[PDB]
Every structure is written in C-alpha cells, then in structure tokens.
C-alpha cells in the first residue's frame with residue numbers, strides 16, 4: 001500500500017479546472033524495464049515472469065475548460081496500465097533492450113493515445129465514442145509519477161512539476177515546458193511557429209506552455225510528447241511533491257520541500273495529507289489566485 | 302474592408318470557405334449578444350437592451366489566454382449586405398483600439414450553396430511587440446473563430 005496525500009482547491013479562481021489521480025496497484029511493471037535479463041538469470045529468476053506492484057500519481061492542470069484534465073484523470077492510468085501489460089508480454093520474445101528508451105516509448109505512446117482520444121481522432125470506450133471530447137481550444141498539463149518499491153518513473157507534459165526531496169534537498173524531476181525555453185523555442189520556430197512575449201512568453205502569443213494534451217488547434221507547435229526520467233529510490237528520499245503551477249508560481253522547490261518534511265515528521269495517510277494540505281494553504285497565503293493541487297507521496301518505510 | 306492603419310498600428314485579414322448558405326452563416330454571426338454561439342473562447346457574454354448600433358457587450362473568455370475579459374461595441378450591422386463591424390473599447394487585453402470588419406458572401410462550394418467569410422482588423426501595436434507578432438496573434442485567434450463558425454454552420458445544414 002502506498003503512502004500519499006492529496007489536496008486540491010479551486011482557490012480564488014472562478015471555477016476548478018485542476019484534476020488529480022492517485023491509483024494504488026494500477027499496474028505491474030515489467031522488470032525487464034528496470035533490470036536486464038542477464039542480471040536476473042544469474043540468480044535463476046525469470047525477468048519476464050516477475051511481478052512488481054506499482055502506483056500511479058498524476059496532476060492535470062487544464063485550461064480552456066476542465067474536461068481534458070478530467071479525461072486525463074480517468075484515462076491516463078488505464079491506458080498506461082494496459083500498455084505496461086502488453087509490453088511485458090512483448091519483452092518475452094525480445095532479447096536485450098534499452099530500458100530508458102522503452103520508458104520514453106511507453107509514456108510517449110500513452111500520452112499520444114489519450115491526446116488522440118481527446119481530439120476524436122480515434123474511438124474510445126460498452127458504448128463507443130468517436131467525436132472529440134471537447135473544443136479545439138481546451139487542453140491540460142500532465143505530470144505523472146509511476147511509483148514502485150525500487151524506482152520512481154516521471155513523465156511530464158506542461159508547466160506542472162514534480163520535485164523529489166533527497167538528502168534534505170529538493171531535486172526537480174521535471175523541467176517546465178515554457179515556450180521561451182531554448183530547446184522549446186528552437187523547436188517551435190523550426191516549424192514556422194512563433195514564441196511571442198504577450199503577457200509572458202506564449203506559443204503564437206496564446207499558450208503559456210509549449211507542451212500539453214489536447215489543444216489541437218495549436219498543433220504542431222504544442223505537442224503531447226512527454227519528458228521521461230527514471231529515478232532509482234534511496235534511503236535519503238523523504239517525499240514526492242506533485243503539483244500544478246498554482247503552487248510553483250509562489251513557492252520554490254526548497255520552500256516546498258522544507259515544509260513537506262516537517263509536517264510529515266510530525267485511502268490517504270494523515271501525515272502526507274497534512275503536508276499536502278499545508279503546502280496547498282501555503283500557496284494561498286503567498287498571493288496565488290489560481291487553482292491549487294498538491295500530491296505528497298511519502299517515500300520512507 | 303477599407304482598413305488603412307496608421308504607423309503605430311497594424312492590419313491584416315483572414316478568410317474561410319463555409320459549406321453552408323449565407324443566411325445560415327449570417328444568422329450566427331449577426332447575434333451580437335451571443336458570440337459564444339460560434340466563438341470558442343467566450344465563456345459568458347452580457348448585453349443589455351435591444352441590439353443596435355452602439356450596443357455594448359461584456360465578454361468573459363476562458364482560461365489559458367493572455368486576457369480574461371473584453372468590452373466591445375457594435376459599430377455596424379447591415380442585414381442586407383451582411384456586414385458586421387465591432388470595436389473593442391475595454392477589457393484587460395493588449396488589443397487597444399481594435400476594430401474589425403466581418404463580411405459574408407455567397408458562393409458555390411462542391412455544387413451546393415456555400416459561404417465565404419472575410420474578417421479584417423486594425424489594432425494598435427502594444428509596446429514590446431512588432432507588427433507581425435501582433436498580426437500573427439490576432440490571425441491565430443480569428444482563424445480559430447472562423448473554423449468554429451464553419452463547423453457550427455455545417456452542423457446546421
């Protein structure tokens with residue numbers, strides 16, 4: 001059973017477009033994505049047959065509406081769970097493998113699949129639906145953390161962030177997809193797009209982020225391609241903080257981690273819930289009028 | 302569309318072919334008190350009284366955009382030539398003195414009655430931006446507006 005807390009509020013904004021997911025035992029990670037077949041065959045264990053439980057935590061900051069963010073909360077963990085199960089069977093007939101390349105691959109196709117369902121370009125489920133989920137101008141960020149006993153796999157899409165506390169220090173596990181970022185800027189202008197300083201740097205002067213699920217009008221400048229990072233766990237790991245920009249716009253990584261260690265030291269766990277509720281109510285004291293969503297996952301035994 | 306911008310302004314235009322009769326496309330555009338009928342960015346619109354020249358509407362736009370509200374005045378509405386002109390008088394956006402002209406014209410598209418929509422604009426260039434940045438920004442929004450108008454008009458056929 002995972003140890004986590006989740007806090008979310010509309011705040012001073014007019015309505016609520018944030019969404020969050022916390023699914024324990026959502027899938028079994030194929031151990032061929034964390035250790036080579038040679039590594040476990042030396043001990044007589046079959047990497048194709050081993051089972052490792054995993055939990056999924058996700059924060060989805062929607063814009064133009066809440067329907068894409070709500071769709072990500074219900075579908076991302078289902079699509080990823082089915083992808084991991086099918087990938088675990090396909091690595092039975094395939095020899096050696098590039099584990100981090102397959103991690104990038106399974107998350108990219110999972111995010112692209114939910115994006116294709118949102119845009120109505122593929123069919124979705126007893127009833128089938130084929131028309132788009134919502135209008136052309138609705139989208140959502142997606143920061144996702146796959147948590148198992150040994151590893152933490154991170155997939156980020158947008159300006160939401162996940163931060164890990166290790167050694168009584170924050171380590172950012174995701175880089176915000178701001179359109180003025182020098183790789184994101186170069187990528188957008190390479191295809192004829194513009195990054196315009198218009199109340200902040202924005203794609204086409206419109207969207208304050210360069211990657212998101214949905215937003216099919218702003219394609220191919222805004223893409224649902226996630227950035228994946230595999231992080232092995234350690235004893236020094238204190239807690240995980242997944243949050244939308246409602247927190248990171250007024251609270252830094254160091255301020256969030258220090259507050260998210262002293263509430264913990266002192267169904268969801270009351271300790272992690274107290275850190276999430278305190279981090280959420282710290283963002284409301286620091287001059288933030290956006291939706292606030294904070295997920296605190298405790299990593300100590 | 303006789304727009305001619307001063308030196309501190311910019312101007313451009315976008316067009317869109319709609320596979321729908323003119324009277325159907327016009328019945329949506331001409332409703333000044335309910336732009337959310339075809340505009341995807343409008344969440345709420347309030348307009349008091351009868352629709353006439355000088356009528357003012359207050360628009361609230363959805364999140365994700367550089368602005369949240371806009372105040373717009375109806376400057377021209379010709380129900381015979383299918384002309385609509387709107388000027389922005391307030392809001393929290395960066396499109397000062399924005400003025401737009403929208404016209405609808407009949408045409409035949411794929412052997413059926415169709416519609417050509419043209420929308421041009423004049424607007425001040427905000428400080429820190431260029432004429433092509435401003436034109437690119439407004440053109441992106443207008444093409445999104447016209448594409449939504451086309452899909453709504455073509456669902457009513």
Ligand SMILES: CC1=CC(=O)CC(C)(C)[C@@]1(O)/C=C/C(C)=C\C(=O)O
Pocket residue numbers: 340342362366367368369370371389392394395396401439442443446
């Ligand atoms: C979508 C939005 C974004 C802004 O930054 C300005 C404003 C709020 C005016 C606007 O509603 C602009 C609308 C435009 C350009 C045209 C229209 O709708 O005919």
Ligand SMILES: [Mg+2]
Pocket residue numbers: 017018061062063291364
């Ligand atoms: Mg939001």
Ligand SMILES: [Mg+2]
Pocket residue numbers: 061244245246290291
């Ligand atoms: Mg936000």
